[PDB]
Structure formats: structure tokens, C-alpha cells
């Protein structure tokens, strides 16, 4: 009967990609994030928006400052040594898989830094563009990041899927396989 | 290689037993290295690496800033919990249990992650030969897990969304 | 529609 929880506000600005990100986490799951370019609050589940609000221009202001701070930190650090922590990839299904029964494939990219990846879904060895969803870079307990990629699909014994993740810390693009 | 530069900031609100005991932990990162900390249990900025010392010395000389941060345990942390206690904290989603052949107990689509799953053969909990995947986070506020038993047959699932335990059994 | 609160990030140096 003990409620023990955690709320995390994570924000960052990244070079040379020139992008910033702002999000709120509750016990490990995203509550929302702010589209810095578009300036609108994006609730992780649509049903949240009935219960809360976030003034988006607040997040924009922060990233603006985080941008400026990055230059200060760059000039401050005598040497910035490039170093990378390679992701660990895992593919699996959201629900138990039944043939002909609609489901979702999850690509769990975890434990990596910097927050920049190239992720590609592969149906039968080829990229898929329809029915794919993406998660912003999520926080962890450590300094590393976490990310989710989703794929909607219809099961069949003929199809086999793969999730391929490329990150500056990997020698060879990591490809994780999944079939029936 | 490819040089990158990251300015990362995490402000963590830790709630132990509701809004009774709360600590705020702000962590500043530069790339892979955490350089600055604000621990509300300390009440001041502390540099984790030399890179963060200038910020620490600068900000700690501002009493009115420190006064505000120490207070952010009420003005922000406890504030947000008041809001999120209406829909996030009490959120409950009932698990879907499925059994298929080693015998696999598939508990999927549940929230929160508080879950207890046991294997009973002949009505006794087979507390051995248990291979579990651990808890898996789908990232959409739903969880899933596979608890397996290596015997050559009924599993029970207890969960905060269940008034009475869910039981399934095989042939 | 009660709005969640956030931490203001300060300029360094």
C-alpha cells in the first residue's frame, strides 16, 4: 500500500544535428513531448490530453537556452573526445501472435548515446514505409538513451520481418530477426 | 569519426510513499559525462566532474536561486503529482493470460508493472525450473512477460487490476 | 485543464 513513483523531465540539444527535444516521463513511460519546430504538445496516449495541459512555448524557451549552453560547454571543455555507446536491439511482438490476427512488432533500441540512429524496418528483406510509428529519445537511469519503433502487420507463415538499427558506435548495422 | 556535442538535462522527481517524502535530482550531462548535480537533500549544486564546477560556483553564490530550487519540491514536484494522480498513477489495465507449449505462461497487455506469476502443478507452486523473461516494457503504457516452467499444470496471475487472481490451466 | 509545471533552465556563464 506504498505508492512509490518517479517523474523525469528530460531535455537536450544536439550538434551537429541541430535538434532539441523536450519530454516528460512517468515511471519509465512517456507522458508527453513537445515538437520544438511545430510548437505543440504531443501526448503519448491521446486520452491524457483530457486531464492535463502543457504550455509549449515553455519548452521552446528551454531548448533555446540549452542551445546556448552547448556552445558554452564546448568552449569550456579543453578536449571533447568522441565516444559512443552502441545500442542493444530487440524485436518482439506487442501481443501473443495469432495468424491472420492484427498485431504490432516492437523494435526496442536501448542503452545508447548519442541520440542519433538510423532505423529501418524490413519485410522479406525490403524496407517498409506503411504502418510505422516512432518514439522520441527516451530517458534512462544512466546517461544513455532509449527508443521504440513500432510496426503494424498481418501475420502469415510466408512473411519474416527484421529491424535494422545503425548507430555511430556499431561496426556493422545491427539487424534483429523475427518470424513465426 | 563523426564528432558530436550534447547538452542533456534531467530533472527527476522522486516520490516515496506519495507526496510525503520527495527529493528532486537535477542532473546535467555533457555527452557521456554527468558533470553537475542538484540534490534537494543537499540543497546546493555539486560538481560531478571538473567540467561542471564553474556552474556550481556560479549558481551557489545566488541564495535566492538556491532558495527557489529547494522549494521546487513543492512548487513543481508535488504540484505535478497532484495532477498525475488523477489519471496516470491510478491507471489500471487488466492482463491477458494465455498458455501454450516447456509450458509458457503469456501475460500481456497490463499496467502497472506490479505483477506476480506462479506455476502450480497438482496445486503446489513449482518453485523450481522457472525460466522467466523478466518484465518487458512495450513503451505504450502496457507491459508483457513470459514465465516458463521446464517440466515434462496451472499458472496463477495476481495483479492490482484484479480483484480476484486469474488462473489458467492446461490439459 | 490544469497545466503541468516544469523547471526553468538557466543560462550558463
Amino acid at each position, epitope marked *: 500500500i506504498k505508492e512509490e513513483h518517479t517523474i523525469i523531465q528530460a531535455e537536450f540539444y544536439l550538434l551537429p544535428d541541430k535538434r532539441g527535444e523536450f519530454m516528460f516521463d512517468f515511471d519509465g513511460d512517456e507522458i508527453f513531448h513537445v515538437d520544438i519546430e511545430k510548437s505543440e504538445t504531443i501526448w503519448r496516449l491521446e486520452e491524457f490530453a483530457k486531464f492535463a495541459s502543457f504550455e509549449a512555448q515553455g519548452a521552446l524557451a528551454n531548448i533555446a537556452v540549452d542551445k546556448a549552453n552547448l556552445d558554452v560547454m564546448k568552449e569550456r571543455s579543453n578536449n571533447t573526445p568522441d565516444a559512443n555507446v552502441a545500442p542493444e536491439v530487440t524485436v518482439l511482438s506487442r501481443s501473443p501472435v495469432n495468424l491472420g490476427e492484427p498485431n504490432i512488432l516492437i523494435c526496442f533500441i536501448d542503452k545508447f548515446s548519442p541520440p542519433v540512429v538510423n532505423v529501418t524496418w524490413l519485410r522479406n528483406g525490403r524496407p517498409v514505409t506503411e504502418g510505422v510509428s516512432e518514439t522520441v529519445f527516451l530517458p534512462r537511469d544512466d546517461h544513455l538513451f532509449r527508443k521504440f519503433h513500432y510496426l503494424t502487420f498481418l501475420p502469415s507463415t510466408d512473411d519474416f520481418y527484421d529491424c535494422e538499427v545503425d548507430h555511430w558506435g556499431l561496426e556493422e548495422p545491427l539487424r534483429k530477426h523475427w518470424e513465426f | 569519426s563523426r564528432p558530436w556535442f550534447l547538452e542533456y538535462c534531467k530533472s527527476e522527481c522522486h516520490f516515496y510513499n506519495g507526496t510525503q517524502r520527495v527529493r528532486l535530482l537535477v542532473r546535467y550531462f555533457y555527452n557521456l559525462e554527468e558533470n553537475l548535480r542538484f540534490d534537494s537533500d543537499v540543497g546546493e549544486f555539486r560538481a560531478v566532474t571538473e567540467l561542471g564546477r564553474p556552474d556550481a560556483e556560479n549558481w551557489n553564490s545566488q541564495p535566492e536561486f538556491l532558495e527557489q530550487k529547494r*522549494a521546487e519540491v*513543492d512548487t513543481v514536484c508535488r504540484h505535478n503529482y497532484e495532477i498525475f494522480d488523477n489519471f496516470l498513477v491510478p491507471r489500471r489495465v487488466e492482463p491477458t493470460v494465455t498458455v501454450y507449449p516447456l509450458l509458457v505462461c503469456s501475460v500481456s497487455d497490463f499496467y502497472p508493472g506490479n505483477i506476480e506469476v506462479r506455476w502450480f502443478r497438482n496445486g503446489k507452486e513449482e518453485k523450481t525450473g522457472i525460466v522467466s523473461t523478466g518484465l518487458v516494457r512495450n513503451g505504450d503504457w502496457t507491459f508483457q512477460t513470459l514465465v516458463m516452467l521446464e517440466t515434462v499444470y496451472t499458472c496463477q496471475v495476481e495483479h492490482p487490476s484484479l480483484t480476484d487472481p486469474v488462473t489458467v490451466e492446461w490439459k | 485543464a490544469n497545466g503541468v509545471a516544469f523547471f526553468l533552465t538557466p543560462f550558463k556563464a
Partner: T-cell receptor
Amino acid sequence: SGGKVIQTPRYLVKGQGQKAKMRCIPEKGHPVVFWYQQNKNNEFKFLINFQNQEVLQQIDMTEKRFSAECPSNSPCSLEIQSSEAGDSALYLCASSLNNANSDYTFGSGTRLLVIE
Amino acid sequence: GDQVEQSPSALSLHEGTGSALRCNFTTTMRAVQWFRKNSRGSLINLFYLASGTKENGRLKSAFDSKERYSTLHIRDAQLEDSGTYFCAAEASNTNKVVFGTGTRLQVLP
């Protein structure tokens, strides 16, 4: 200097259509500067805020009708391009140290009167 | 219309008496600030409160984040305590400082 904010001039009278430039020296070591316009009802109307030379925020009126700059090692300034009767008010300058804070310290203010 | 509910509007205190000014907030405020404008004087900064109470001479100020109010207490009213008193606070869920409606305090000798 400090801890004091020096706004000059104390009073100012201009003819409709004339330029009205007013200056403000933020407290020593204070990078944050705010400009407020107060009317007869003790209402504080936000105009523009700087940090050093960079403008963080401003309103439509200040963008179209006012011109402000806060030069390095030079007094901050707010200038009305074309004064009109509606611009008669108290213009307040406030400087802070940390953008993520309050603790404004206001200046003496410039009282501007626009007449025909 | 978008200012802080500050009461009372005006106030008359006999020299040597005391009374209290109060701001009512519509949400959780991050910190509160109190100002006084003299007679032909500048805005003088009186307090910066983030929590609890602070006392400065014959002035004590209090801020309760949860209960959404802040009070300024004047005791042993003197002549120089005359002026207009403003409070200013910024909401925890916004970036913008908002001001009180103001209080005109006159001290009778």
C-alpha cells in the same frame, strides 16, 4: 553600478510623431533586462526582454512600433519611432541576474508624455 | 484581468499600528516578490520568497505555495511606510511574471 538601476531621463515630453528614446543601465553584472509599460491603473504591460544583446521575447507592438537594443558595455535603450497619445505612460526597466528566477530590481522609471 | 488578486485596494494606518496585505494566486506559484513605490520614489524591492517566511525590520512576509497565497505584514507603521505595494510572482507552469493589482497605503501620524 549597483545595486541600483539608472533610468534616464526621469521625465520626457514629446510631440506626436516625434521620437522618444529612453535609456536604462541595468545593475552591475546583470545580464537580464525587462521593459514594462505601466498605465494609470497600475497595470504592468510587458514590452521586451533581453539577455545581454539577444532578444528573448517581445510583443507585436514593440516589434512594429518600438526599437530596442542593449549594446555591450553601453546603456540599454528603448525608442518609440512615432510617438502617439496612447504611448503616454511610465516605462520601467528591470534587471535580473538569472533568467530562471525572479528578483527583479526596478529602475526609477521614465515618465513619457505625448502631446499634440 | 490578468493580474494577481491583491487586497486591500487602499489602506489607512494610524502611526504605530499594523495590518496585512495579501495576494491570492490562481495556481501554484514558483516564488513571490514584494515591491513598494515611494512618494516620487523608485520601486524598492522588499522581499523575495520561495517558501516560508522572511522578516525585514518592521516587515514580515509569508508565502504558502500550496495554499496559493502570500501576505505582507506591516507592524509599528511609520511615516515612511507610506506608498503603493505590489506583489509579483510567476506561475510554476508558465514562464511569465505577473503582477498584483496594487495596494495604496497611507499612514496617519
